[PDB]
Design a protein around this ligand. Sequence first.
Ligand SMILES: Nc1ncnc2c1ncn2[C@@H]1O[C@H](COP(=O)(O)OP(=O)(O)O)[C@@H](O)[C@H]1O
Ligand SMILES: O=P(O)(O)O[C@@H]1[C@H](O)[C@H](O)[C@@H](OP(=O)(O)O)[C@H](OP(=O)(O)O)[C@H]1O
Ligand SMILES: [Mg+2]
Ligand SMILES: [Mg+2]
Length: 216
Amino acid sequence: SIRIFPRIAGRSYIIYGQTSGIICKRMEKSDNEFVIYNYISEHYDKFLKKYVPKLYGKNNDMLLLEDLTYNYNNPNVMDVKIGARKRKSHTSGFFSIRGYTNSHDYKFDPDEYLTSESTINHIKNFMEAGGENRDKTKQVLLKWIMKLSELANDLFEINLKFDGVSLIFIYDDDCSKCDVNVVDFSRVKLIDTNDQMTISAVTNLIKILSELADNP
Ligand SMILES: Nc1ncnc2c1ncn2[C@@H]1O[C@H](COP(=O)(O)OP(=O)(O)O)[C@@H](O)[C@H]1O
Ligand SMILES: O=P(O)(O)O[C@@H]1[C@H](O)[C@H](O)[C@@H](OP(=O)(O)O)[C@H](OP(=O)(O)O)[C@H]1O
Ligand SMILES: [Mg+2]
Ligand SMILES: [Mg+2]
């Protein structure tokens, strides 16, 4: 029977597949998320390959998605909202941390508006599972910067409003593996320009992670 997937943020009904390495996400309201996966697949295959979890297929209202945590022994996950919010402004100005592994233990609240200092403290909290090993965490930060830089650069040539999309940052406890990918295309729209709001979210994140990777 059904094992609920340990979501770290959001609200969607997400379960493990009956099969390894697959999560099933229930679309609500409409199939827009499906329409946008297919739209990206046709018009921007490279963006889809580099940055988005594989969509293996559809089953009524369920998207069969690549489990981004599957290849990790001890995954640590952070959801950061980089697309425009529906109704409220971002909790950290240009982006909103939505949740992370053990976030409740540090009294993280997705509704709390944060200063620069609290924003950095929460990312430091996310990184705490990495240990004191100062220069294996540095390697995790640098690989995140590498991919976020390419993403911000590719977003200039992509005519989509990434309303509501999140970065999912993932690192193993042993810091042997990490990655970051974009998810939640539920509210993404066609436009005839690039999304400067979303670009500014990635560049601000790159700035913050760079300051972390550097400081002694
Ligand atoms: N492909 C994925 N692999 C692993 N975890 C995922 C994946 N997609 C979503 N998640 C988890 O689900 C949460 C919410 O997913 P999201 O697509 O934002 O849906 P919603 O906001 O509608 O609940 C994320 O914070 C993350 O923990
Ligand atoms: O249900 P509605 O009325 O469309 O409201 C949105 C819905 O709850 C989304 O699932 C949520 O994204 P998350 O699940 O990723 O939080 C989004 O947050 P945002 O506005 O912070 O994108 C809400 O505005
Ligand atoms: Mg979401
Ligand atoms: Mg709702």
